[PDB]
Amino acid sequence: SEDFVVTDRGGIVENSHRVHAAVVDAKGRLLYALGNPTRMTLAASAAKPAQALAILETEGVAGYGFDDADIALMCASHSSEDRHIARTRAMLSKIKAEEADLRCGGHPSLSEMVNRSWIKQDFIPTAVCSNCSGKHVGMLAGARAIGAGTDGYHLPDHPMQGRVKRTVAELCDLDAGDVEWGTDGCNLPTPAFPLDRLGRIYAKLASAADGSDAGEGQSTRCAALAHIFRAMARHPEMVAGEGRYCTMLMRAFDGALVGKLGADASYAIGVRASDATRQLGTDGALGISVKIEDGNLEMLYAVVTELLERLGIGSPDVRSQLASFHHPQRVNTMGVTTGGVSFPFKLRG
Amino acid sequence: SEDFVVTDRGGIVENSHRVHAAVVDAKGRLLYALGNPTRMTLAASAAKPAQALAILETEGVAGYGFDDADIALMCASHSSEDRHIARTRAMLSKIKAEEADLRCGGHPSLSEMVNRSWIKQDFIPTAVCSNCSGKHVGMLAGARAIGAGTDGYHLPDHPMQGRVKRTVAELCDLDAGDVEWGTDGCNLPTPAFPLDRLGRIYAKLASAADGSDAGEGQSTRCAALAHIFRAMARHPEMVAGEGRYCTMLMRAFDGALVGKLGADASYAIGVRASDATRQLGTDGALGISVKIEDGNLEMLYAVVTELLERLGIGSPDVRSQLASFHHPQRVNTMGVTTGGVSFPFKLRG
Ligand SMILES: [Cl-]
Ligand SMILES: [Zn+2]
Ligand SMILES: [Zn+2]
């Protein structure tokens, strides 16, 4: 419960970061942990698969013809690359809406290279550039589909947000009062719930993919979760973008898991049943959720990759694709190596 | 002690950050604390007044004619504004050296607005653009002055770095073995020592300023320390830059204190004797040092400003110049305030 990632300069402690993590089976049962695995935690973008489920379950959304890449964008914190903006526009045309209907705002790109090119051309980002633009088009779609009208689709009193709030609690297996709600950077309601339940959501996504693959009679909701998993794993460049952790992670694993960033350094992974998960002592899929207490994103990616290695998820060759995140470079302005990152935590079973 | 600064979204905890702080008198005696006031801490740029002392105490350096603004740049983590680069080049001319003699490297500017101009211009920062460039020119100056040789002025075996190492330990009142050393981003040795001793350095700076102002006989060391304080207080724009915390802080206080940032969220302040310092229980100058365990810079400035309020240093009107740092904006992409910062820590005496 005193679990840290620690950075050093020449062996001298620089910063230390408290780690919380939960590893759960398909029913949410805790298998491993770091820190406080039930920490009440703001899920932010890590909750988007649950918001995508509310959208996909809305009567009439099926008629718009969203494809797997559209759903991946719904699930995205994308880098605002030109292909992300283009897909946002295509999805707006599917529901006969326009950029002015979006109630999210522009922000500097989550990708440094994209942001640099915007600065170079004095580009001012707008609503269609939001990292959450696919989720917002999906919410516009649901509001239009049930004839609720698009103005106010983002407000808590709107039936689309009523559907979101109910769906999040159901996937977490919590009562409505056990989920807290604030306002997100994209101006939508955003939930907070115990960290282990974020893992439970992703364990259910991977379990639904396994059940779909195995030809099981799934409920419609399990079918839709299977679809969300498949969409994310098939189009991981839409979920984030070039150079991004989530994209590189999901590409490396080639369908064996999905992974998603949450704001202020949280992360969730849904792992399909495998030799690794069976070795970990469960007979189904697995869920992983992580939170760095102070919010440092660089440390998040380092810790998640170390956790994948300790859990034996993937092969050493597969995870070596993430080496630049696992041990972030610590070189000074003259090319001299001056420091490092250590993982003194111990996963408890 | 469980001393934190905490951010929230709608009252839901987002991130928390552990706080360490030391408030010391002129002899180093601990008056108040947060967290662990003796935490072994890399001083990084907060050590620069001690490095400047070692420069100014190198025999012959007086002959180059560095003025107070030059000395303020030796003490700086500047924003690489054009005036900082220009002064660096002027200082190299004073010592008949060239940019190729520097052993620090360029880096993206510490100022977002400067770095935005650089991006629009495709400007590549070079050695004279380093936030440490003034310190490096001073070290070259001292190497030249004693006849050592400029090659290797930055290496631990060089007499300039031997002088730095001895000077840091003396100011801290530590044996050599109680100061650890690593290599800095600017490619110089950088010390680590207990956090309270950083406060001690700055108490001694402010105490020397008081002794000079009162006309007391001073040792060559105290006279040099008083000069460093005066240079920083008179030229705070050289120590950091427009819009930077250290510059706004020192301008607001108009000579009553000096302050300096260290990388990975450390800060140090030397306070001249005043009603505030007497009210705090000491009869001379005071030093303050702070470290955010996880290295978040926004949180550091919020904590330092909150600490000055709690210590009664300044007036509500002097401190209000720092209001944007004290309570950082938490506004989303649509202009809605979504949260805030809180200070659940308790000063202890
Ligand atoms: Cl470095
Ligand atoms: Zn969002
Ligand atoms: Zn430096």
Numbering used by the authors:
A (entry chain B), B (entry chain A): 4 to 352
What does the paper say about this structure?
The ReAV enzyme from Rhizobium etli, a representative of Class 3 L-asparaginases, is sequentially and structurally different from other known L-asparaginases. Asparaginases (EC 3.5.1.1) catalyze the hydrolysis of L-asparagine, generating L-aspartate and ammonia.
Thus, replacing the protonated Arg47 side chain with alanine disrupted the hydrogen bond network in this region, rendering the mutant protein inactive. The substitution of Arg47 by alanine affects the conformation of Glu17, which can no longer form H-bonds to the Nη atom of Arg47 of the complementary subunit. High difference electron density peaks were detected in the close vicinity of the Ser48 hydroxyl, as previously observed in both the ReAIV and ReAV crystal structures, and these peaks were interpreted as three water molecules forming very short H-bonds with the Ser48 Oγ atom (O…O 2.30–2.50 Å), as well as within their triangle (2.40–2.50 Å). The hydrogen bond network at the Ser-Lys tandems (Ser48-Lys51 and Ser80-Lys263) closely resembles that of the WT protein. Only one conformer of Asp187 is observed in the electron density maps, with one of its Oδ atoms forming an H-bond to the water molecule from the metal coordination sphere. The R47A mutant was inactive as well, due to its inability to anchor the L-Asn substrate in the active site.
